[PDB]
Amino acid sequence: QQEDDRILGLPGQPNGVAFGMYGGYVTIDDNNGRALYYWFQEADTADPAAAPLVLWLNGGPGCSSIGLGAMQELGAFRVHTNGESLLLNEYAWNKAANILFAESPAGVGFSYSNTSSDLSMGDDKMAQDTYTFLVKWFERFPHYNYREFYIAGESGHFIPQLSQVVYRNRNNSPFINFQGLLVSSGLTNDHEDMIGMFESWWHHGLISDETRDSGLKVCPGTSFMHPTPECTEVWNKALAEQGNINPYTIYTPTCDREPSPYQRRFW
């Protein structure tokens, strides 16, 4: 079980890495054949056993914790422009904790299911599937049982909802010594968030007076994942007025290589 998961070294890996790494699959449904892939970077500290354990998740829904979390944001390595070798990130978060990246749900990255119908997901099935992963990851790594545990990451839905399932089950799985959560850039309440979007875009000079007033009149109340036709019509005019900015970082330069990897407006 865990000894087989040990990563001995990566192609293109820099010279000084001293911390431990593990990677592999944890089957969460034996019957349908569904399994999630994980990469674990241990703390680069004087006593890693003293350091807490943190689960990092990216959102979308649909984007990868390894592709975003580990390789472009907070993980130990960063990729060179040749797409073949690595460099160490000196602001890596495993200088302060043991960091666990899981790709979730199945269908994302290396995670898969042998039953196709498993790829239609919802919020409650996601929290249940990632909790089962966690229970099974602790049995493969029994020495992390009761370590001070935190859930962190970029989704307004996944991080509070998984934290609620861990919390309601603490007498069933007490070895998950759950201390708290860190939520980045997340959706929290459809109505307040929707007023905040049209007002912020107008006060940054991105949309017109009349897109703002129509938006405020027809969209608060609507869902972002399942919008009414009335609100989609205003929403599409607003995205048109913004032009070719990167909407995730509005003052930086855009990537010239235009077969973009991101084809949806991932939340």
Partner: protein, 158 residues
């Protein structure tokens, strides 16, 4: 750390589909998944069903149980802007324990790292000059925020 590259997604797409890398990682054993590795899946996004409209009751149950709860935003993001999270968190109507203030890397440092409010039970932090993916734009500031969160200590005032 090398400077910001808007095209860095492509270096990861390439490295993660190299066969020797998938071997060392113990990923995609025996060519078990048909499609190649990519950053995000359009089929998961497009087939998504049930999506909650209001997370504030979940926040109230976690705060009441005494869990540490911190939330942060990058302030040049337009997909979930600072205005949206400010208004949703304010609707919790928690008492304020430390009013809105600018934080610095150290109390003796000069440049504003962002702003922060502490309510009874929840801390909110913005990172100045950072987009949605906060560690790609402001790495030093995001590491400091991480360290303060683990200690349960507010972001440094002047």
């Amino acid at each position: 750390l090398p400077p910001y590259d808007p095209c860095a997604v492509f270096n990861s797409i390439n490295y993660l589909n190299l066969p020797e890398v998938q071997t060392a990682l113990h990923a995609n054993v025996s060519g078990i998944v048909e499609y190649p590795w990519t950053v995000c899946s359009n089929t998961i996004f497009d087939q998504w069903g049930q999506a909650a409209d209001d997370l504030l009751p979940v926040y109230r149950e976690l705060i009441q149980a005494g869990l540490r709860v911190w939330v942060y935003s990058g302030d040049t993001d337009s997909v979930v802007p600072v205005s949206s999270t400010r208004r949703s968190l304010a609707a919790l109507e928690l008492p304020v324990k430390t009013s809105w203030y600018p934080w610095y890397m150290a109390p003796t440092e000069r440049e504003v790292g962002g702003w922060s409010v502490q309510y009874e039970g929840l801390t909110y932090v913005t990172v100045r000059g950072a987009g949605h993916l906060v560690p790609v734009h402001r790495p030093a500031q995001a590491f400091l925020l991480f360290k303060q969160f683990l200690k349960g200590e507010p972001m440094p005032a002047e």
